Design a protein around this ligand. Structure first.
Ligand code: HEM
Ligand code: HEM
Ligand SMILES: Cc1cc(N)nc(CCc2cc(C#N)cc(NCCc3ccccn3)c2)c1
Ligand SMILES: Cc1cc(N)nc(CCc2cc(C#N)cc(NCCc3ccccn3)c2)c1
Lengths: 362, 362
């Protein structure tokens, strides 16, 4: 059965892939080779072209992603050759470096060897390669509450955070055959961080907010043609609302709105004052300004939505069905100011795609 | 078949209704009476208790409604006795008066005779009993673009708007047997309007914005126990975002954000300035302030969401399944600041409920 699942996915993927690549005539022979390879080995190996295009298609099919206009320019790094934890580590360091690109962020994915018989070769524990630790000890909250469980697992492994609000978690991953993951501290020179200041309100720096430049999702599974790349960290640049309206603002995250309201000189007493909404806007203005001032790529949600509209037009002009998850595509601030809010999207799952997988901790 | 549909809906409704009313023992006899009545007449008549509770249940089941905490306090006006257009008119005038209640808005529904054989007794054309006309003539946009088609239909019938941005549409409805609807101008003394001013920014009155006090949806069908009350206008009070983030802000509505941005003294040039978001907040602050200052009921979206949370807790404590349409329950500004955003809702359709029906114009 597992072989038949593999085969059907391969057929569907190869056909679609080669069609887009203009290699339609090569489908027949490639399918035979894959058929034979599955029969003998229980699997098959993607050519570099298939893999690159697979990762790009997967991005293009990510319903929840507003950034998909640029799917075709994804930088795909093929690291299916890694066998050792130092190679994995170095590949992750390299991804961070080349993705960051001195602030001019390059959407990049590094692809590690795929699961074999559902056996992972590399198991990355990080939710993002760059993320802040979180602690909760007797009422005491420090750092990012979303990182609490991973932070606790890291500290089980002999790592110790300094317990600032912005401790960088180490990279943590397990190799096939090892009982325990290994962790490596991130070199600070690799990690770009942006102090959050406001263009007009000087007191805003009193909050001592910052965030990291590059969101690098490292815990999803890339599936291409029935091959499961469980370890395939990818990054884009941030849309400002992800930082200003969620990471810094959410009550279950950094929860900064009351402090924001205080530094911008408004009372945080009455719902009817819309102080949260007002704080959200200034915080979000601060984030965009701060990233721009530092030369770190970021997009505001209006521009992102305009770009997504072009993705929709591009999809239709290419005769491709467009899929989307309205609930994630709308920005968490002023969603009704975007066109996204005023239409519907088919939330069908098309493959290749990125998928959630179970956490190895917790 | 239509009789069997009616019967099944009646069985399900009566059982549920009487259970909630504590009249469980009366279900059997009432069901027999209804059975006989359907057999003889092809229909049945709701008792006042069933009708009142039906309308309340329908509100309680309205997935898209964030205001459902107060479902049980809906004021139900039973006007199934009306036969003439003057009675309909007067019932609509009365609804507006009693709903408005000098600004202390009472959620109210007026229920007119139901469809018979799918034949309407009363067909209301208005989307809301109080709404502004809209005109579009050779590039010239005036009033509410959402009212353009109804406005044009009204002007077919000999009504003429003054072509201000805030012409009140007349009530327009058709009686069974009449080819044409009739229209009646709304008495101005019945319609509360609120000038929009800002608590801190005096220039805001230069926009000369206003809105009406009471949203009275008049074009939906109330269905209770297989009986279709196609004419059953209902109202609540506004949540401020409906006015500030949609009616006044939407590009396809009054489209005031650029003007708002100008009076609040910010440039409307760069997406990264989040001027739309900032304009939205000030506009929404203005709306809440203005309604409060005038003594007209309104709720801000934070308070509304807090109330909805209580509706959810009430539903679970009562053992009732909660249904909701996440896409409508989240407010169009700062949705992620509400709990609604961070959970999911089952969008199943439970009856009794309010339903869309085809417009008689366009
Ligand atoms: C180029 C810059 C990018 C931007 C601005 C962007 C924007 C976003 C945003 C804002 C979300 C979450 C929506 C929300 O918060 O409600 C998202 C989700 C997502 N993006 Fe992108 N994205 C970018 C690049 C990428 C890339 C390069 C990939 C993969 C190759 C990707 C795949 C995804 C996926 C899979 C999700 C959903 C994750 C989940 O379900 O948890 N995006 N994107
Ligand atoms: C008491 C004050 C009320 C408030 C604040 C309120 C709030 C709202 C809001 C904000 C929406 C639209 C959600 C959006 O804009 O995305 C809505 C939709 C709705 N409300 Fe309420 N509501 C109230 C009273 C009522 C009453 C009294 C009824 C009926 C008896 C009702 C039935 C509905 C229905 C049916 C919808 C959906 C309409 C559609 O699908 O087009 N609401 N409510
Ligand atoms: C590559 C990449 C780039 C970028 N700029 N953003 C992302 C988004 C990553 C992401 C991962 C997860 C995860 N896991 C959750 C969210 N957002 C929460 C969205 C949300 C939450 C609730 C309701 C509606 N939307 C976002 C990925
Ligand atoms: C009785 C009542 C009270 C109140 N305060 N609001 C309403 C809402 C009426 C309403 C009727 C229609 C209608 N027809 C559409 C909307 N809102 C548009 C919501 C929306 C649009 C797009 C995406 C998500 N949400 C609202 C009804």
């Amino acid at each position: 059965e597992e072989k038949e699942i593999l085969w059907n996915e391969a057929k569907a993927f190869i056909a679609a892939c080669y069609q887009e690549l203009g290699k339609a005539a090569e489908v027949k022979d490639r399918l035979a080779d894959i058929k034979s390879e599955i029969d003998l080995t229980g699997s098959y190996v993607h050519t570099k072209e298939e893999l690159e295009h697979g990762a790009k298609m997967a991005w293009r099919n990510s319903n929840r992603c507003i950034g998909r206009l640029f799917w075709n320019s994804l930088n795909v790094i093929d690291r299916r050759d890694v066998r050792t934890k130092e190679e994995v580590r170095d590949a992750l360091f390299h991804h961070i470096e080349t993705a960051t690109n001195n602030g001019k962020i390059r959407p990049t994915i590094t692809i590690f060897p795929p699961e074999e018989k559902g056996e992972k070769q590399v198991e990355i524990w990080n939710h993002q390669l760059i993320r802040y630790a979180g602690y909760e000890s007797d009422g005491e909250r420090i750092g990012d509450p979303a990182s609490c469980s991973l932070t606790a697992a890291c500290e089980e492994l002999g790592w110790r955070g300094e317990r600032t609000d912005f401790d960088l978690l180490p990279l943590i991953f397990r190799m096939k055959g090892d009982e325990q993951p290994v962790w490596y501290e991130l070199p600070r020179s690799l990690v770009i961080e942006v102090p959050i200041t406001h263009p007009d309100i000087e007191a805003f720096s009193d909050l001592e907010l910052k965030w990291y430049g590059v969101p690098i999702i490292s815990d999803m599974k890339l599936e291409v043609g029935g091959i499961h790349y469980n370890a395939a960290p990818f990054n884009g640049w941030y849309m400002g609302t992800e930082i200003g309206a969620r990471n810094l603002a959410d009550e279950k995250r950094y929860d900064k709105l009351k402090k924001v309201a205080s530094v911008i000189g408004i009372a945080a007493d009455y719902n009817t004052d819309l102080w949260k909404d007002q704080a959200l806007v200034e915080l979000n203005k601060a984030v965009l300004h701060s990233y721009k001032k530092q030369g770190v790529s970021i997009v505001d949600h209006h521009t992102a939505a305009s770009q997504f509209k072009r993705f929709e037009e591009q999809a239709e002009e290419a005769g491709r069905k467009l899929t989307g998850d309205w609930t994630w595509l709308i920005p968490p601030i002023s969603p009704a100011a975007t066109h996204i809010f005023h239409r519907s999207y088919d939330n069908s799952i098309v493959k290749p795609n990125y998928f959630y997988q179970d956490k190895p901790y917790e």
